[PDB]
Amino acid sequence: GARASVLSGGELDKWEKIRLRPGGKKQYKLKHIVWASRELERFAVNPGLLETSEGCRQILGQLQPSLQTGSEELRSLYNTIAVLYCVHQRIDVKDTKEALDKIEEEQNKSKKKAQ
Amino acid sequence: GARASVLSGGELDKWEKIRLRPGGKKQYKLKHIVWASRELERFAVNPGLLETSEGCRQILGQLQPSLQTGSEELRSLYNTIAVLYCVHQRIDVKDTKEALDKIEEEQNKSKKKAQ
Amino acid sequence: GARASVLSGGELDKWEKIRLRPGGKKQYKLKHIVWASRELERFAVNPGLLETSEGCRQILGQLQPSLQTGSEELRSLYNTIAVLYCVHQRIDVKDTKEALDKIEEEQNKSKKKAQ
Amino acid sequence: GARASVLSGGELDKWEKIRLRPGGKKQYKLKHIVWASRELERFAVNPGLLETSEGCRQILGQLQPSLQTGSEELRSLYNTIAVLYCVHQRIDVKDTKEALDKIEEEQNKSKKKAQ
Amino acid sequence: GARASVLSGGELDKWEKIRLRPGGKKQYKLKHIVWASRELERFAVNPGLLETSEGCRQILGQLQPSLQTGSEELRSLYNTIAVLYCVHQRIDVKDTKEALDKIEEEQNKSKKKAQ
Ligand SMILES: *C(=O)CCCCCCCCCCCCC
Ligand SMILES: *C(=O)CCCCCCCCCCCCC
Ligand SMILES: *C(=O)CCCCCCCCCCCCC
Ligand SMILES: *C(=O)CCCCCCCCCCCCC
Ligand SMILES: *C(=O)CCCCCCCCCCCCC
């Protein structure tokens, strides 16, 4: 399926069109996820969770209470996974802030039915 | 993005362990994926249908009325997609028949709510 | 004192007779314990815990909410600690799987005393 | 404003007047803060929290669940942060034992409002 | 730890985002703080008040009867202290006119309750 993910219409075509900060001029590149797998190996977490929507959801849930306490490098790792989740859900975003709004709307829906 | 599919216990590891017919001493090789891409390219099919399991189901759905008419090569393409579906859904498939039983389970379930 | 550790029928004498994996020829070695003890620095955990059954059990309790997202290294350490707990409590387990069942059986009994 | 904490009665002055232990002639030095910061950066914790008591109260919460199994270095780091909290809120602490008497006492007092 | 103040996202990263006057392009610079320390030293007042939000809030109450008759330097100094109060509360103030509104805004609220 990785062979399809690299075609011009797939998930990794979508990945490199996304902006850093709504005003910004930088974009995501493929090695951002490679770096995210390196951090998951450092923190002893299965890297295969990046390949799934369910794996990405739980990792975002693990990261969540420690974001402010953590440095902006941790937040960069979280943002990388939040953008990837948005790609896995087949939705386009223009920037990271927009991807974070997508996680927040899903959390608003999820929160209602989590009792 | 993709990280476990290439590793042991992953999708390619299942591909090279799954038997062509249940007692057979030959397993699927990676060339069948390339051949399946070529048949799908000949049909002019969307590549995202090999990224997701629902897409594999669209391919399976069109193939399904054609199987009885089809050659063993046409049926090989169906079995190839059926294994990729089961593999993408992380089923510990040992052979082609087990992959088919799971595809049959999905049809039987779909029929159960088709009223 | 220290001299009693290597006494025959003792915990060290038993460790080497135990299978790493049920079907295999691979036995547990003291090098596994040495590697595990080093990696407590990585978790920021006291090595003195490995002396005592209660300390080993606390290591299992710390590992517990990470197990299902953890990488194969985390599972390998958990499994190793479970065999160490069984050896410390003088329970004859022939391989890793028996230890995993017995650690669970204590927790399952504890569960009806815990609220 | 940080430059006005260099003055007698300020933060730098209170820090270096506190004994490391309840016994022995060794006192805390500003270089201990550098080691504690370097460990917090290694754990990927935000330095921006170190000038704020609310930030320090969070850092004390971050270290708290792992104290039980914690290394002597992790416990020493916790003690170092605890003295900084006392220094920030200008408590006249003579040693680590007074800082930790005051913290248990403040926790008992805090618990009687928040529960 | 005191490095937090000059960290990006710290107080003195914020100090330089502020324009001196609504129509001026020059920013607030760190020497305004050094100057304020010297002005306090010249008129025999302890500079420790600078390190804290409350000491700045108190200076604004104290120098309030001095504003009506004081010199341009006195008004500049009062405005500098209002900006420090705003910076201690980590506010991205556009300019002096805003810093002054922020002080009045908290004062109407405080004056009702601090009787
Ligand atoms: C999905 O299509 C399974 C195919 C085999 C896994 C491919 C792993 C990535 C190899 C490098 C990219 C090749 C692109 C044609
Ligand atoms: C997720 O799908 C992101 C895709 C980018 C993966 C790039 C991996 C590069 C690995 C290079 C070293 C090993 C092969 C020579
Ligand atoms: C430790 O302090 C000794 C405790 C009492 C003896 C335990 C058994 C020791 C067996 C190995 C050494 C035998 C020496 C004659
Ligand atoms: C308030 O007085 C705090 C600092 C105000 C302006 C920042 C300039 C740098 C101060 C720290 C210097 C440290 C030198 C080792
Ligand atoms: C936090 O920044 C604590 C600062 C303590 C300064 C004095 C001791 C260390 C001096 C050299 C390293 C300075 C790093 C900011």
Swiss-Prot record, chains A, B, C, D, E:
Outcome recorded upon mutating residue 66 to A: Loss of ability to fuse with target cell membranes and infect host cell
Chain residue ranges for the region called Interaction with host CALM1: 7-42
Subcellular location: Virion membrane; Host nucleus; Host cytoplasm
Region (Interaction with host AP3D1): 11-18
Membrane topology term: Lipid-anchor
Renumbered ranges of motif Nuclear export signal: 15-21
Stretch list, region Interaction with membrane phosphatidylinositol 4,5-bisphosphate: 72-76
Function text: Targets the polyprotein to the plasma membrane via a multipartite membrane-binding signal, that includes its myristoylated N-terminus. Matrix protein is part of the pre-integration complex. Implicated in the release from host cell mediated by Vpu. Binds to RNA.
Assembly and binders: Homotrimer; further assembles as hexamers of trimers. Matrix protein p17: Interacts with gp41 (via C-terminus). Interacts with host CALM1; this interaction induces a conformational change in the Matrix protein, triggering exposure of the myristate group. Interacts with host AP3D1; this interaction allows the polyprotein trafficking to multivesicular bodies during virus assembly. Part of the pre-integration complex (PIC) which is composed of viral genome, matrix protein, Vpr and integrase.
Protein name: Matrix protein p17
Span covered, complete protein: 2 to 116 of 1435
